[PDB]
Amino acid sequence: MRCIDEVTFVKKGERHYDTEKGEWIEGAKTETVATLNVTDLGTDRSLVIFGAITQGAKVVRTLPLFNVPDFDYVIIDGKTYEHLTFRSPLYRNSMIFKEVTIED
Amino acid sequence: MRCIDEVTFVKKGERHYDTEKGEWIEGAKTETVATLNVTDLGTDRSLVIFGAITQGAKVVRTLPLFNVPDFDYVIIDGKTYEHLTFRSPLYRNSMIFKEVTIED
Amino acid sequence: MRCIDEVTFVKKGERHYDTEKGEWIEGAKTETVATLNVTDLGTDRSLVIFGAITQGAKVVRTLPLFNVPDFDYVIIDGKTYEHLTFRSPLYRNSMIFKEVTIED
Amino acid sequence: MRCIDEVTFVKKGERHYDTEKGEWIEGAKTETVATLNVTDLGTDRSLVIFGAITQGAKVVRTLPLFNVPDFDYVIIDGKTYEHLTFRSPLYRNSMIFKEVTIED
Amino acid sequence: MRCIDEVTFVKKGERHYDTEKGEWIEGAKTETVATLNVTDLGTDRSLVIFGAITQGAKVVRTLPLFNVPDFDYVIIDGKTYEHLTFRSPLYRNSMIFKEVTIED
Amino acid sequence: MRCIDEVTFVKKGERHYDTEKGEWIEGAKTETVATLNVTDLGTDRSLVIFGAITQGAKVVRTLPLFNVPDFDYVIIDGKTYEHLTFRSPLYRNSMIFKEVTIED
Amino acid sequence: SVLEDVKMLLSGKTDEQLEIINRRTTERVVSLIGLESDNEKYKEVIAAVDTIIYEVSLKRFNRIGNEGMQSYSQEGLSISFPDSDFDEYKDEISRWRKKLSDDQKGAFATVFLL
Amino acid sequence: SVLEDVKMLLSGKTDEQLEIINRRTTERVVSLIGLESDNEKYKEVIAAVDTIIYEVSLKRFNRIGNEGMQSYSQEGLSISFPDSDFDEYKDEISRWRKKLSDDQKGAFATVFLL
Amino acid sequence: SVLEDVKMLLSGKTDEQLEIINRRTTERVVSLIGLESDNEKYKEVIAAVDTIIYEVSLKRFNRIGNEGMQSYSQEGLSISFPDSDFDEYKDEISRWRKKLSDDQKGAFATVFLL
Amino acid sequence: SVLEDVKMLLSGKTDEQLEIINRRTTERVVSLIGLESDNEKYKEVIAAVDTIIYEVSLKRFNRIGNEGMQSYSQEGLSISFPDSDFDEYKDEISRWRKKLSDDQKGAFATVFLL
Amino acid sequence: SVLEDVKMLLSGKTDEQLEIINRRTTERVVSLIGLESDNEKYKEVIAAVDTIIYEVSLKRFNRIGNEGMQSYSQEGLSISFPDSDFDEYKDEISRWRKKLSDDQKGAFATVFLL
Amino acid sequence: SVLEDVKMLLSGKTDEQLEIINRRTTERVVSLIGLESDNEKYKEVIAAVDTIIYEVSLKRFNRIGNEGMQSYSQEGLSISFPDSDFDEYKDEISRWRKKLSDDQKGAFATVFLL
Amino acid sequence: SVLEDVKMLLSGKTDEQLEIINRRTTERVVSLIGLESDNEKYKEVIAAVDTIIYEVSLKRFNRIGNEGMQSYSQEGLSISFPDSDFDEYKDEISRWRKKLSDDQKGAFATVFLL
Amino acid sequence: SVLEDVKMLLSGKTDEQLEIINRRTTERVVSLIGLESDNEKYKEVIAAVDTIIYEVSLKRFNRIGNEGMQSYSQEGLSISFPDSDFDEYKDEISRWRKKLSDDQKGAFATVFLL
Amino acid sequence: SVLEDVKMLLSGKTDEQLEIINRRTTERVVSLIGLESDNEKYKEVIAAVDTIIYEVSLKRFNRIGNEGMQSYSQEGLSISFPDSDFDEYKDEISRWRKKLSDDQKGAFATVFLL
Amino acid sequence: SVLEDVKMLLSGKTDEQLEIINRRTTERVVSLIGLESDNEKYKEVIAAVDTIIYEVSLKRFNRIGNEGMQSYSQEGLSISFPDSDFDEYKDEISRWRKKLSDDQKGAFATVFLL
Amino acid sequence: SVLEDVKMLLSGKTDEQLEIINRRTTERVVSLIGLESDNEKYKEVIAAVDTIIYEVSLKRFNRIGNEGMQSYSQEGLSISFPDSDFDEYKDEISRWRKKLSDDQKGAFATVFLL
Amino acid sequence: SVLEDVKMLLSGKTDEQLEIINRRTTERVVSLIGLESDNEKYKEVIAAVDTIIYEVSLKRFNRIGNEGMQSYSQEGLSISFPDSDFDEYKDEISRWRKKLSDDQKGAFATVFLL
C-alpha cells in the first residue's frame, strides 16, 4: 500500500495536583514522527446544548516490522486526534481515531 | 461525470450584539458561483408540535483540481441549504446538504 | 412502463376563520385527471386507543414530459390519499402516498 | 401452485347494545368454503402478566379469477384466525393471518 | 440427514391445589424416547440481579413419517429443555428448545 | 489450522466466609497449559462514571481429540480473560473471551 | 379490427379477452403449418391440432400484462419467462408442414424435375 | 370450447380440474406419437401409454396457473420449472413413433424404391 | 412529422398513442418483408400479416418510454427486455420474403442465366 | 384407472400411496427394458430387476408434493432436484435391453439379411 | 454548426432538441446506405426509409443524459443499455446498400472485367 | 415387498435400518457387475467385494430420507450431495465385469468367429 | 501545449471545455481515416464527417475526468463505460480509409505490379 | 463383518474406529494395485506403499460424519470436499500396476501372440 | 533523472507533474513507432501524432495514486481500470510503423534478397 | 503403526508433530521419484532433495487437521487450499524420475531392442 | 546482501526505499533483455530503456509490502493487482532482445550453417 | 538441518528467518537452472541471477503464516494468492537452462549421433 502521509505521536509527562495553588502541574512532551497510511471517514454535524460542533475521524494502517511508540494523542495535519479502537490482526496494526481539543 | 447545474456559495459577514438596542448587527454577504453535479434524495413529511413541515436533501460531488471556497450556506435553485456531512476521499469532495430557512 | 390507471389531483380553495360563528369558510375545489402507473404496498392493522383501523399506501410513477399540477390530495379509486415522500431523479417523478379521511 | 387445503370465511351479523339487560345481542353467521394455498410461519411463546400463551400465524395465497367474499375471521383446521396484512399485487391476493380466540 | 442422538419426551400428570396444607399435589410422569437430530447454538453469559447464570439452546429436526408425542419438557443429555418455537413446513417438524430448571 | 499460541487454564479453590474476621478465605490454584489458536477482536474505549477504560476480546478455537479442562478464567499473554460464549459444533469447540481484573 | 382488439385487451372483460385470444391463436397456428382454405379436409385438420391451440391460448392468457417482458418484479411478486411460446412444438409443426406440403402439392422439401 | 375449459380449470373445484387435465393430457399424448383414428388396435395403444398420462397429469396439476414461466415468487414462496414436461420421455416416444409408422404404412424412417 | 408523433406518443392520451403505434408498426412490418407499393395484390398481403401487427403492437405499447434499454428500475419496479421484438418471427419473414421476391421478379435467392 | 390413482395421491393414506407408487414404478421399469408377457421367464426377469424398482419407488415417495419442480422454498425449507430419476441406471438398462432383444428375437441392434 | 448543436442539446428546449436529433439521424441514415444527392429518386428513397429514422430518433431522445454509458445508477433509478443502436437493422441496410449500388453503378459487390 | 421395507427404513430403529441398507446394497453391488446365480464361485465373488459394500452402506446411511436431491435446507442446516454413490468405483467395476464375462462365457468385449 | 489544454479542460468553464473537445475530436477523427493535409478536397472531407465528430464530442463531454476507467463510484453514483468510443464506427472508417487510399495513391489494399 | 464395523463407526471409541479404518484402507489399497496373495514378495510390497495407506487413513478419519457429502453447513461451521480421495495418487498406482502385471504375468498392457 | 521525476510525482505541484508526464509520454510514443533522430522529417512526424500524446497524457494524469492497480476502494469510492493504455491505438501504430520502416529503410516486414 | 502416529499428530505437542511430519514427508518424497533402497548413492539422492522436503513440511504443518478439504470456516476464520501440495514440483520430479530410471536400469522412457 | 536490503525497504524512510527500488528495477530490466557487461555500447543501451525503469519503479513503489498477492483488504481498503508488472512491455522486450542478439552474436532466432 | 530450520521459522527472530529464507531460495534457484559445482564460472553465474533470488526471497518472506493457502480471511483482513511463485520467470529460466546445457555439455535439447 501507498504510505506517504506523516503522523506524529505525542506522549505527555507526569502529572500531580498541588492543593495550595489549586492547579495541575505537568512536565514536558515527547514527540516522534512517522510516515504511514491515512484515510478519512468524513466530518459530521452534531447538536449539543450550547450549540453545534463538528468532529472528524481518520483511520491509520500499518504493515509489519513497524513498532508503535507509546503515546496519548496523535497530531495529523495540524489537528489532534485520540484513538477509539485498536485491532492487531496477524502482526499488523489498524487504528480508528476521533478528534479532540487539547489545551494550548 | 456530467456537471451542468449551478451552485452558489455564500459567506456572511462579522456579527456583534448591541445591548442598548437589543438587536444583532451584521455586515454584507459575499457570493461565489460554480458549476458542479447535484442529485436529489427526496422531500419528506415531518410532524412537529405546531404542525407539518417539508424538508429536502441534496448531494454535491466534485472532481479534483477544484477548491471549495469558504462558505456558510449554499443556494441551489432558489432554495438555501446547509451542509451536514463532508467527506474528502483521495483529493475529491462529496457533501450532503439539508434545507434550512434564512432570514430575508 | 404500462400506464393505464387513472389518478385525479384535487386542490382546495382559500380558507379563513369566521370568529363570530366559530366555523371555517372554504372555497371551491379544482380537479384534474391523468393516467399514470400505480402499485400497492398492502393494508396493515394498527391498534389505537379507541380501537383498530386499517390504512393503505400506494406508489405513483411518472416518465418525463409530464408536469404534475399543484395539488393537496389525490383520489385513486374512490379513496383519498396524501403524499409522504417526493423524489425527482433525472427529470422523473416518484411519490409515496398514505390514506387519510376527508370531510364530506 | 398446489392448492389443496380448505379455508372457510365467516361473517358475523348485526350487533346492537341492550341497555336494560346489559348484554350484546347478535344475529346469525354466514359461512362460505374455498380451497386455497396455505403455509405456516411457526408458533411462538410470549410471556404476559397472567402467564404464558402460544399464538400461530399462517399465509394464504390466491391466483386470479378468484374473488374473496366479505368476512371477519377465517377458520383453518379447527382454529380461528384474523388477518393483519392485505396485499393485492397485479390482480393477485396475499394475506397474513394470526390466531385469535372467539366466543363459543 | 444423520439421526443418532437420543431425545426423551416427558409429560406431567394432573395437578390440583390443597388449601389446607398449602402445597401443590401432582401425579406421576410418562417418558417416551426417540432418536432425532440435534445441534447446538451456544451457551451465553447473562447478568441478573442476584448474579450470573448460564443458558443454552438446541434445535431438534425431524423428517416426515414421525409423530411427536404430547409433552411438556424434553431431556437431552441429562439436561431439561422447554421449547420456544414450533414450525411445521411441508409435513416436517423443527423445534427450538431453551434450557429451564425443573424441581427434583 | 496453525496452532502455536499458548493458553493457560486456571481453576480456583474452595471458598467460604469467615464471619468473625469479615474476610474471604480461599485455597490454592491449579493451572494447566495448552497450545491453541487465538485471534483478536480489537480494544474499544468505554466511558464510565469514574472515567474511561479499555477492554479487549479474543477467540479460541480447537479441533477434536482435545478435551478442555474445567476452569474459571484464562491467562493469555499476561492478561486474564473470562468467557462469554461457548459453542460446540460437531465435536469441536469455539470460545469468546472478555477481559477482567483479578485480585493479586 | 386490430385497434378494437388491442383496446379490448387493455380494458375489457374476461369473456371478450378469451374470445380474442382464441381467435388470434387459431389464426397463428393455421398460418404456421401452411393450411389453405381450398383444402377439402379443412375442418378435420382444424380439429386435429386443437391441443396446440388450447395450450398456447392458456399460456397467452396467463401473460396478460407481461407482453414482451423477460422479467418482472415488484413488492411481493417476481416472474420470469422463456424465449418463445412455440419452442416445444417443433417436431409436430415440422411433421404437419411436410404432410400438408405433400397433400396440397406445395414447394416445401420437394424435388422438381425441369 | 376453450373458453369454458379455461374458466373451469382456473376457477372450478378439484374434480372438474382433474377431469379436464386427464382429457387434455390424453389428447396431447395421442398427438405426440402420431396415432391415427382409423387404426384397428386403438384400444391397445391407448392402454399401453397409461403411465405417461399418469405422470404428465401429476405434473400438470402442480403446474396450474403457471404456464410458460421459468420462475414464480409470492410472499416467500419461490418455485422453478423445467423447460417442458415431455423432456424425459424421448426414447420411448421415438420407439413408439417408429412402431406406429411401421404399422400404419407411414413415411417416417422408411426406404422407398420408386 | 417525427416531432409531432414523438410528442403525442410521449404526452398524449391512450387513443392517440394506440393509433400512432398501429401506423408505425404497419409501416415497419411492410418494410421488413420487402413489399412494394406497385404490387397488384397489396390489400391481400396487408390483410395476411394482421396477427404479426397485432402482437407487435401489444409489445410496443408496453415498451413505451423505454426504447433501447435492457433494464429499468424505479422504486422496486424492475423490468427486463429482449434484444428485439421481431426475433421470434424469423421463419415467417423469410418465407414471405421469398414469396414476394418470386412474385415481384426480384433478385433474392434466384438463379440468373446471362 | 388414472383418475382415482391421482385423486388418492393428492388425498389419501400412506399404504394406498405406496401401493400405487410400487405398481406404477413396476409398470414403467417393465416398459423400459422391453419385456413382453409372452416370455416364459417373466417371473425370473421381474425378480432380477427388483433393486431398480425399490430405489425408484423410494425416490418417488420422497417427492410427494414436488412433482415437476426443480426447486422449492418457504420460511425454513429449500430443496433442489436433478434432471431425471433414471439417469444413473443407463448401463444396466442397455445391457438388459440387448439381452432381451437377443432372447426374444427382437429388432434392437440386430443385423438382418434379406 | 457542431458547437451550437452540442450547446443546445446540453441546455435547451424540447422542440430544438427534437429538431436537432431528427436532422442528425436523417444525415446518419442517409450516410449509411450510401445514398448520393445525384440520384433522381432522392425523395422517394428518403421517404422509403422513414421508419428507421423515426425509431432511431426516439431511441436517441430517450437517452438524453446517458450518452456513451452502458449503465447508470442512483438513489431510486437504474438503467442498462445495449451495444449499439443499429444492431437490429442489419438486413434492411444490407438490402438497401446492394440495391443502391446496383442502381447508381457503384463498386460494392460488383464484378469488374478489365 | 417394497412397502414394509420402506416403512421400516423411514420409521424404524437403527438396527433394522442398518440391516435393510446392508441387504439392498449387497443386491445392488451384485447387480452392477453382472454376477450370475449359477456361478460356481459365488461365495468368493461375494467376499471379494466386501469393502465396496461397506463404503456404500456408510454413504447410504447418511443419505436417508434424502433420495434424488441435490440440496437440502432445514433451519440453518445445509447439505449438498453428488450425482451418484457409485461414481468413484468405475475402473474397478469395469475390471470386475470383464473378468466375470470371461469366466461365465458372456458377450461383453469378446470376439466371435462364426 | 498539453499543459494548458488539460488545465482548462479540468478547471475551466463550459464554453472552453466544449471548444477544446471539438478541436481534439476533429484532430482524432482526421487522424483515424488517414486524411492528408496535401489533399485538394480537404474541406469536402472535413464537412462529410460532421456527424461522427458531433456524436463523439457528445460522448466525450460526459466522459470528462474519467479517462481509461471501466467503472466509477462516488457516494451512491455508479457509472460504467465501454471499451472505446470509436467501436461503433468500424465499417464507416474502413470504407473512408479505402476511398482516401485510392484517392491519394496509397498502399492500403492495392495490387502493385513491379 | 460389515454390520458390526458400521455399527462401531456410528457409535464407538477412537481406537476401534482407527483400527477399522486402517484395516479397510489397507484392503482397498491392496485391491487397487492388483496384488495377489500368492506372490513371494507380499510383505515387502505391503511395506513399500505404506505412505498411501497412512495418508488415506488420515483423510478418512477426518471425515467422520461427512461421508458422501460435498458440503456441510451449520451455525458456525462450513466444510467443502473434493471429488475423490485417490485423485492425486494416479501415477504411483499406474506404475505399481504395470510393475505387478509384469512380475506376476498378468493381462494388463501385455501383448499376446496366439 | 528517474529519481527526481519519481520523487516529484510522489510529492510536488501540478505544473511539475504535468511537465514530467508530457515528457515521458512523448518519449514513449516516439519509442513505439520506431522514430529515429536522423530523419529529416522529425518535427512533422512529431506534430502528426500529437493527439495520441495528449490523450495518453490525460489518461496518465487521471491515474495519480493508482499506478499498477486494477481496483481501489474506500468508504465512498470505487475505481476499476482496463488492461493497458495503448490498446485502442493498434491500427494507427501499425500504419505508422510500416510507413516509417519504408521511409527509413528498416527491417520491419521487408523482403531481402541476398 | 498408523494408530499411534495419527494419535500423536492430532493430540501431541509441537516437537512430536514436527518429527512425524518430517519422517512422513521424507517417505513420500522418496516414493514419488521412484528411488530404490538398493541404489548405491542413496545418501546423495536423499541430500539432493532437501529443499522439497523443507517446503512440503512447512505446508503440511499448516494443513494439520484439514486433509482432503477445499474449505473451512470456524467463527470468521475462512481458509482455502489447493488441490495438492506437489502440484508446483512437476518438472523437477520428471527430471529426477528420468535420471533415476536411467541410473537404475528401469523401463521408464527407454527404447528396448529385443 | 538481501537481508539489509529487505530490512531497509520494509522499515526505512522514503529516500532509501526509492534508491533500492531504482537499483533493483535497473538490474531486472538489464536481465530481461539479455544485456551483457562486455558490450561496448553499455551506456547507450542503459539510457535507451529509461522510460521502462521509470514506469516499473512507479508501479513497484505502490506494490510495497504486497508481493505475490492477488488481493488485500484492511478495514475497507481493498486493492487488486495484475499478474505481473512486465505484461504490457512484450513487443518492446522482444524487439530489444532480437537487436541485442544480433549485435552480440547470439543464438536467438539466428540460422546457423554448419 | 530441516527440523531446525522449520522450528526457527515457526518461532524465531527476523534475522534468522531472513537468513534461512535466503539460503533456501538460493539453493532452489541453483537447482532449477541445472548449475553444477564443477563449473569454473560458478561465482559469476551466481551473481548473474541475484535479482530472481532477491525477488523470490521478498515474496517468500511476505508469506510467513500463509504457506500452502490460496485464501485467508479474518475479522478485518483478507488475502489471496496466485498459483506459484516462479510463473513469471519462465523465459529467463529457459534461456539459462539452454545456455548452461550448451556450456557443460548436458543432455537438454541436444542432438546425439550414435
Q: Which residue is closest to L82 within chain N, CA to CA?
A: N70
Q: Which of G81, G82, G14, G89 is nearest to G54 (CA)?
A: G89
Q: Do chains B and O touch (3 or more CB pairs under 8 A)?
A: yes
The per-residue DSSP string of chain P comes to -HHHHHHHHHHS-HHHHHHHHHHHHHHHHHHHTT--TT-TTHHHHHHHTHHHHHHHHHHHHHSSS--S-SEEESSS-EEE--S-GGGS-SHHHHHHHHHHHHHTT-STT-----
* Integer Cα distance of G20 and P5 in angstroms: 81
F93 beta partners: F62
> CA quadruple K11, K13, K16, K20: dihedral positive or negative?
positive
- C-alpha distance from J80 to closest chain D C-alpha (Å): 17
Hey, how many other C-beta atoms are within 10 angstroms of the C-beta on O76? 19
* Integer Cα distance of J36 and J100 in angstroms: 9
Hey, how many other C-beta atoms are within 10 angstroms of the C-beta on N84? 12
Q: How far is CA C99 from CA B52, C102, N26, in A?
A: 16, 10, 77
Contacts of O20 in chain M (CB under 8 A): none
Long-range contacts, stretch M82-88, CB < 8 angstroms, 24+ apart: M82/K68, M82/K70, M82/K83, M83/O82, M83/O87, M83/O88, M84/O88, M85/K68, M85/M56, M85/M59, M85/M60, M86/M32, M86/M56, M86/O88, M88/K84
Residues 41-60 of A with CB under 8 A from B: 41-45
Q: How far is CA R3 from CA F104, H64, P74, in A?
A: 41, 70, 30
Q: Which of L76, L40, L79, L43 is nearest to L62 (CA)?
A: L79
Task: Enter the DSSP assignment of L38.
Answer: T
**What cell was used for D35?**
380451497
Q: Is E98 on the interface with D (CB under 8 A)?
A: no
Residue with cell 481534439: M24
* Integer Cα distance of M79 and M68 in angstroms: 13
What are phi and psi for residue C53, nearest 5 degrees? Answer: -140, 165
Between the CA atoms of C24, C30, C34 and C40, what dihedral angle is there, to the nearest 10 degrees?
Answer: 10
Long-range contacts, stretch C95-99, CB < 8 angstroms, 24+ apart: C95/C59, C95/C60, C95/C61, C96/C57, C96/C58, C96/C59, C96/I75, C97/C57, C97/C58, C97/C59, C97/C60, C98/C55, C98/C56, C98/C57, C99/C55, C99/C56, C99/C57
Contacts of R10 in chain F (CB under 8 A): 4
The experimental technique used to determine this model is cryo-EM
- C-alpha distance from I57 to closest chain K C-alpha (Å): 14
Residue E80 one-letter amino acid = T
Residue with cell 462450513: N78
Hey, how many other C-beta atoms are within 10 angstroms of the C-beta on D77? 11
The answer to whether N57 touches N21, Cβ cutoff 8 Å, is yes
The answer to whether A96 touches A57, Cβ cutoff 8 Å, is yes
Contacts of F39 in chain R (CB under 8 A): 74-75
The answer to whether R61 touches R21, Cβ cutoff 8 Å, is yes
* Integer Cα distance of B79 and B98 in angstroms: 10
Q: Which residue is closest to D92 within chain G, CA to CA?
A: G77
* Integer Cα distance of H14 and J3 in angstroms: 12
Helix, strand or coil, per DSSP, at residue I104: coil
- C-alpha distance from A39 to closest chain B C-alpha (Å): 7
Q: Which residue is closest to B46 within chain C, CA to CA?
A: C84
- C-alpha distance from A91 to closest chain B C-alpha (Å): 27
Return the exposure string of P54-89: e unless at least 16 CB atoms fall within 10 Å of the residue's CB, then b: bbbbbbbbbbebbbbbbebbbbebebbbbeebbebb
Contacts of F91 in chain N (CB under 8 A): 65
* Integer Cα distance of P22 and R10 in angstroms: 14
The answer to whether D4 touches D20, Cβ cutoff 8 Å, is no
Of H11, H61, H77, the CB nearest to D61: H77
Residue with cell 505437542: P13
Q: How far is CA A34 from CA A7, A8, A38, A70, Q16, in A?
A: 5, 6, 12, 13, 15
Q: Which residue is closest to L74 within chain N, CA to CA?
A: N74
K15: left (phi over 0), alpha (psi -120 to 50) or beta: alpha
- Distance, C-alpha C98 to centroid of its chain: 7
* Integer Cα distance of F10 and F30 in angstroms: 6
**What cell was used for Q101?**
542478439
**What cell was used for J46?**
421381474
For H34, residues 6+ apart whose C-beta sits below 8 A from its C-beta are: G95, H97, H100, H101, H106, H108
**What cell was used for G84?**
418463445
What are phi and psi for residue N60, nearest 5 degrees? Answer: -65, -40
**What cell was used for E103?**
424441581
Q: Is L83 on the interface with J (CB under 8 A)?
A: yes
For P44, residues 6+ apart whose C-beta sits below 8 A from its C-beta are: none
Q: Which chains have 3 or more CB–CB distances shorter than 8 Å to chain L?
A: E, J, N
Length of chain B as a residue count = 104
What resolution (Å)? 3.4
- C-alpha distance from F89 to closest chain E C-alpha (Å): 6
Listed in sequence order, the DSSP H helices in N14-114 are 14-32, 42-48, 50-62, 90-104
Residue with cell 439452546: E57
- Distance, C-alpha R87 to centroid of its chain: 12
The per-residue DSSP string of chain H comes to -HHHHHHHHHHS-HHHHHHHHHHHHHHHHHHHTT--TT-TTHHHHHHHTHHHHHHHHHHHHHSSS--S-SEEESSS-EEE--S-GGGS-SHHHHHHHHHHHHHTT-STT-----
The answer to whether C82 touches I98, Cβ cutoff 8 Å, is no
Q: J65 vs E89: CB contact, 8 Å cut-off? A: no
Q: A90 vs R77: CB contact, 8 Å cut-off? A: yes
The answer to whether D40 touches D56, Cβ cutoff 8 Å, is yes
* Integer Cα distance of R114 and R112 in angstroms: 6
Q: Which residue is closest to K64 within chain M, CA to CA?
A: M58
The answer to whether M26 touches M19, Cβ cutoff 8 Å, is no
Residue with cell 371555517: C24
Q: Do chains M and O touch (3 or more CB pairs under 8 A)?
A: yes
For Q99, residues 6+ apart whose C-beta sits below 8 A from its C-beta are: none
The helix or strand, by DSSP H or E, that contains position G93, with its residue range, turns out to be: helix G90-104
For G62, residues 6+ apart whose C-beta sits below 8 A from its C-beta are: H65, H66, H67, H68, H69
Q: Which of Q84, P57, Q68, P32 is nearest to R83 (CA)?
A: Q68
* Integer Cα distance of O54 and M9 in angstroms: 12
The answer to whether A45 touches B85, Cβ cutoff 8 Å, is yes
* Integer Cα distance of N93 and N89 in angstroms: 6
The answer to whether M91 touches K42, Cβ cutoff 8 Å, is no
**What cell was used for G94?**
415440422
Q: Which of G59, G33, G60 is nearest to G46 (CA)?
A: G33
The answer to whether D94 touches G76, Cβ cutoff 8 Å, is yes
Q: Which of P55, P77, P64 is nearest to P14 (CA)?
A: P64
Q: How far is CA M24 from CA L79, M6, O54, in A?
A: 60, 11, 9
Q: Is B78 on the interface with O (CB under 8 A)?
A: no
Class of residue B39 by CB neighbours under 10 A (exposed 0-12, middle 13-18, buried 19+): buried
Largest CA distance in chain M: 65
Helix, strand or coil, per DSSP, at residue Q108: coil
Hey, how many other C-beta atoms are within 10 angstroms of the C-beta on G84? 12
Three-state SS letters, chain E:
CCCCEEEEEEEECCEEEECCCCEEEECCEEEEEEEEEEEEEEEEEEEECCEEEEEEEEEEEECCCCCCCCCCEEEECCEEEEEEEEECCCCCEEEEEEECCCCC
- C-alpha distance from R73 to closest chain P C-alpha (Å): 5
Q: A43 vs B84: CB contact, 8 Å cut-off? A: no
> CA quadruple L26, L27, L28, L33: dihedral positive or negative?
positive
Q: Is P81 on the interface with R (CB under 8 A)?
A: yes
Helix, strand, coil distribution of chain F in percent, nearest 5 = 0, 60, 40
* Integer Cα distance of Q6 and R18 in angstroms: 9
